[PDB]
Symmetry: C3
Subunit: 193 residues, 3 copies
């Protein structure tokens, strides 16, 4: 199987506006598939149709509507509560890589705290050490400079083994989404073996 599978977790940062650009780039990438997990807050910054528009844009398709979304569904907490398979378990099995872009201060704090009362955090909590995780913090600079940020980055890094694509240095802006994609393709390369 020559397919690399990425789960993109988007959280309640303004940088979630670039989530459709990332998905569009991953779709167009030949041997990479992408599934998206959106926290409730992140859904305020983009819609499913933004993603669909973004996929068509990247694939040089004319406008129109679907439907099956090419097929890249944006999963939310609601989907999980509707012997049957459990969604965050299915996503854990599927994923070869988990990318949190953007990662808000809240999600960072929740991850460091081990709290898992959403699809996104249940997925991360359920992961096996098989699956690598890339965290891209994205927040107001005064949120990033907060004392608890570095303590949570520490927990997330040393304890959990997550990789931090730390924000651009007013430090706090997310790593540019194009850089995110090429980081992802670098892992796809590793995986192809």
């Amino acid at each position: 199987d020559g397919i690399f599978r990425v789960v993109l977790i988007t959280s309640g940062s303004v940088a979630s506006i670039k989530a459709p650009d990332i998905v569009g780039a991953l779709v167009k990438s030949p041997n990479i598939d992408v599934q998206v997990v959106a926290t409730k807050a992140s859904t305020y910054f983009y819609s499913q149709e933004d993603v669909d528009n973004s996929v068509r844009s990247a694939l040089n398709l004319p406008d129109g509507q679907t439907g099956e979304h090419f097929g890249v569904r944006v999963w939310t907490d609601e989907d999980e509560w509707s012997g049957e398979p459990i969604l965050h378990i299915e996503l854990r099995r599927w994923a070869d890589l988990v990318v949190i872009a953007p990662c808000s201060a809240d999600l960072l704090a929740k991850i460091a705290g081990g709290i898992c009362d959403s699809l996104a955090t249940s997925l991360l909590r359920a992961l096996g050490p098989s699956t690598p995780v890339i965290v891209c913090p994205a927040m107001n600079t005064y949120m990033y400079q907060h004392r608890l940020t570095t303590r949570h980055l520490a927990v997330v890094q040393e304890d959990l083994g997550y990789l931090v694509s730390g924000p651009q240095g007013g430090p706090g802006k997310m790593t540019d989404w194009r850089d995110i994609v090429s980081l992802i393709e670098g892992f796809a390369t590793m995986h192809q073996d």
Copy 2:
């Protein structure tokens, strides 16, 4: 007063399906009363009528409907927000024992974190050292193997003095509900003095 009073806290684990069997067993037990606190997630795995059906089953009653629930009401967060007495305070006073079965990873993390934005966690936070607590973790094995699980079990055990009926060793399955009940009856025995 020869009555032993148990508050059962059920959380969002699949093992919550066995919560009605526990309640049915505690009701039938001669000198034990039970009250139930359900987190919102746990209410997805069983209903009030499951409990009622389970009580009738244990008490050899024919089917029918109530009403007063024998009277074992499943308390939820909603009830608490409807000089008046505060529910989680009333439950703390009432309880001789608090049993968390099942305890999800989320609830474990919330307890260890001291977060109390629900009936269940407000009750635990408000307890006096008079009242013992039994925690029965129940989660996907990769959630239990997560690094933060053991750190939270440590906080819950050493700091809070909670007793952990640790999961069955794929470690993560809840202690069998029949074992839970007999653990409970062992405390009832202690209490009878």
Copy 3:
């Protein structure tokens, strides 16, 4: 500019009933303005009209209705999600002082945990060290005596530099609201320079 600006954060403690008395006192105070941030739980203990009634009472105004609220709006989480300015950022810039009165055990735990999934906690997380913070814990005495309370007060104090107007010694009752106001006026004095 001879105006001192206070943001009052009210949380889900019964002491939130005195929040309108505080606002009324701050409004009447000549060189002090007040804005209010209410957690969802705190909105159960008082309404906007309680505040308005309380302002009229303090300003010797006859009853009637508004409208513009004099103008002291009680901000909630809902307002924040309705290039545009972000509310908790605007409030951070505005505030010369942040007062958490009352501070529940939950909010204390969330602050210590760095969790910021509400207007109140996003505001606190986004603050600059320029702005001082006064925390007034207010909870059931058994919640205050809980082991995690002192650990959170420690984090909040040493790590974050927040000032704790610790509860009255059954320790747990909030510092009397009149004492809160005069503490606030003491900071206004400092600020006037």
